[PDB]
Enzyme design. Structure first.
Site, PDB file in Angstrom:
ATOM      1  N   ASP A 130       0.685  -1.457   0.313  1.00 48.13           N
ATOM      2  CA  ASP A 130       0.190  -0.280  -0.116  1.00 48.13           C
ATOM      3  C   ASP A 130       0.550   1.122   0.005  1.00 48.13           C
ATOM      4  O   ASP A 130       2.185   1.087  -0.362  1.00 48.13           O
ATOM      5  CB  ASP A 130      -0.961  -0.157   1.138  1.00 48.13           C
ATOM      6  CG  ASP A 130      -2.171   0.579   0.856  1.00 48.13           C
ATOM      7  OD1 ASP A 130      -2.211   2.011   0.584  1.00 48.13           O
ATOM      8  OD2 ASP A 130      -3.063  -0.109   0.815  1.00 48.13           O
ATOM      9  N   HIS A 193      -2.737   2.781  -5.174  1.00 46.06           N
ATOM     10  CA  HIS A 193      -2.089   2.396  -3.406  1.00 46.06           C
ATOM     11  C   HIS A 193      -1.012   1.846  -3.452  1.00 46.06           C
ATOM     12  O   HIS A 193      -0.374   1.120  -2.584  1.00 46.06           O
ATOM     13  CB  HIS A 193      -3.203   1.461  -2.713  1.00 46.06           C
ATOM     14  CG  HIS A 193      -4.271   1.656  -2.362  1.00 46.06           C
ATOM     15  ND1 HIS A 193      -3.996   2.061  -1.339  1.00 46.06           N
ATOM     16  CD2 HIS A 193      -5.557   2.792  -2.729  1.00 46.06           C
ATOM     17  CE1 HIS A 193      -5.978   3.112  -0.275  1.00 46.06           C
ATOM     18  NE2 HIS A 193      -6.308   3.277  -1.498  1.00 46.06           N
ATOM     19  N   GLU A 258      -9.370   3.156  -5.146  1.00 43.99           N
ATOM     20  CA  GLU A 258      -8.766   4.379  -4.759  1.00 43.99           C
ATOM     21  C   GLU A 258      -7.939   4.009  -5.961  1.00 43.99           C
ATOM     22  O   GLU A 258      -6.936   4.980  -6.049  1.00 43.99           O
ATOM     23  CB  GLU A 258      -8.817   4.601  -3.758  1.00 43.99           C
ATOM     24  CG  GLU A 258      -9.580   3.709  -2.566  1.00 43.99           C
ATOM     25  CD  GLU A 258      -9.605   4.325  -0.809  1.00 43.99           C
ATOM     26  OE1 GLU A 258      -8.959   4.103  -0.801  1.00 43.99           O
ATOM     27  OE2 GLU A 258     -10.768   4.139  -0.282  1.00 43.99           O
TER      28      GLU A 258
END
Ligand SMILES: [Zn+2]
Length: 469
Positions: A130, A193, A258
């Site tokens: 991440d 990410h 995202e």
């Protein structure tokens, strides 16, 4: 009257009038009549008889026997005799850990695995990468260790955080899980990410920033790997080769969550690549990116999964996506069916175990409360019939770890809600009720204290202290 306290609730329990004060296993047989994931456990005054359809059902039957032994240990008067015939509602029953945000030492993973196996979870998903860290070693990419696995602090606390698994540790984890009925699913989150990857290898990105550091805060990163760069594809091929060696599940979660496309839109390489491919927008580019990644996986016999982001058109029919965004569960079920996708239910309204479980516990300024009772209200199919929801493979609860720095904090938020998730994934609706679940969970406090030296009691004030804010 007298009952068992098995979580998840078995699909059929037929109680008898006699009492058993021993659970010695008298027989343990593989029988053709039962499905391979099913068992029949008969409790008699002389001991117990286990029949199973295969190794998987046998593991589950032994897990029920373990819970019955824990019950009997606290019930000197004995437990009821009876017949338990049991098989899971859904084949995918998972928890996700997040060592990317806070590294989980090997010994702590073992305890996490033992506890989830106790509740018949069968999937452990590792969020390995991440913005805040990268935990998978990859031969030929030593800056993943020297840069991407380390960060300066967390939320201004001044305390460096680092960690990276060894290949030997990950192979140990795979074998440890397999012995307990659990398949391990690695996640390499892409194309976003990726702040930790950018800190190590800025050359993989549309707008390389050599000064980029591994992220020390939450929030969204716009940094996407650039699909036009050959180094990106050589890197992911190397990553996937390591996953092929380590993780025999053959399933690679590619993330995809995202990932705003602003930087792809602006990238001078991506702009002309879209012109060459006649791509009208960056969602077409995202579809092509995932298709190229899936082709790399297919060379190793691997298959992808994704966080569902609300545009079914970017996935290929037959792929599995995880529904997670708030308020979108019903639409996701309908759209994935229409697109020919398989679905795992991870709705953040019920399944995001990073959220506080009692109102007033730390919410970091944004998290809603998900109580144990709310969690138990989850039907992964949301009441939909099999013709509308048969492509749902099961349930999955992430324990995101931005704010969970050690196993003590992780287990505090994971349990007892993971017990409710376990019952939602396993038990037929016809045997489920909040009243029965709550009764059994009260008994499980002593079971888990005895077996794991861990206390599942939850009050607003008994969450372990945090160092932030
Ligand atoms: Zn680019």
């Amino acid at each position: 009257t007298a009952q068992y306290s098995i979580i998840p609730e078995p699909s059929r329990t037929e109680l008898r009038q006699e009492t058993a004060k021993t659970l010695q296993l008298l027989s343990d047989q593989e029988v053709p009549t039962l499905e391979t994931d099913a068992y029949r456990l008969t409790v008699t005054p002389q001991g117990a008889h286990l029949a199973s359809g295969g190794r998987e059902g046998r593991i589950y039957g032994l897990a029920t026997l373990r819970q019955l032994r824990d019950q009997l240990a606290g019930q000197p008067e004995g437990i009821p005799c009876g017949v338990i015939t049991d098989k899971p509602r859904y084949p995918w029953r998972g928890l996700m850990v997040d060592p990317a945000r806070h590294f989980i030492p090997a010994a702590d993973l073992k305890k996490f695995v033992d506890m989830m196996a106790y509740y018949k979870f069968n999937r452990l998903h590792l969020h390995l990468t991440d913005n805040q860290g990268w935990r998978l070693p990859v031969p030929g990419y030593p800056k993943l260790k020297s840069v991407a696995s380390r960060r300066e602090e967390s939320f201004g606390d001044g305390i460096p955080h680092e960690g990276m698994y060894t290949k030997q540790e990950l192979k140990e984890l795979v074998a440890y899980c397999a012995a307990r009925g659990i398949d391990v699913i690695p996640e390499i989150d892409m194309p976003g990410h990726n702040q930790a990857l950018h800190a190590a290898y800025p050359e993989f990105f549309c707008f390389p920033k050599p000064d980029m550091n591994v992220r020390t805060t939450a929030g969204n990163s716009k940094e996407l790997v650039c699909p036009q760069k050959p180094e990106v594809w050589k890197f992911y091929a190397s990553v996937f080769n390591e996953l092929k060696d380590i993780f025999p599940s053959g399933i690679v979660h590619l993330g995809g969550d995202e990932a705003p496309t602003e930087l792809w839109e602006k990238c001078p390489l991506c702009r002309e690549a879209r012109t060459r491919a006649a791509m009208k927008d960056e969602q077409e580019q995202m579809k092509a990116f995932f298709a190229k990644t899936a082709a790399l996986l297919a060379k190793n016999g691997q298959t992808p999964q994704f966080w569902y982001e609300g545009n079914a058109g970017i996935y290929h029919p037959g792929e599995t996506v995880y529904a997670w965004r708030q308020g979108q569960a019903l639409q996701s079920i309908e759209k994935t069916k229409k697109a020919g996708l398989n679905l795992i239910m991870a709705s953040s309204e019920y399944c995001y175990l990073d959220f506080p479980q009692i109102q007033g516990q730390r919410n970091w300024g944004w998290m809603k409360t998900t109580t144990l009772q709310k969690c138990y209200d989850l039907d992964p199919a949301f009441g939909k019939p099999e013709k509308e929801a048969g492509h749902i493979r099961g349930v999955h609860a992430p324990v995101w770890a931005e704010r969970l720095p050690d196993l003590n904090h992780l287990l505090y938020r994971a349990y007892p809600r993971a017990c409710a998730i376990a019952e939602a994934g396993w038990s037929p609706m016809g045997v489920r009720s909040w009243e029965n679940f709550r009764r059994k969970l009260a008994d499980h406090r002593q079971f888990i204290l005895k077996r794991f030296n861990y206390d599942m009691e939850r009050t607003q004030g008994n969450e372990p202290a945090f160092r932030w804010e």
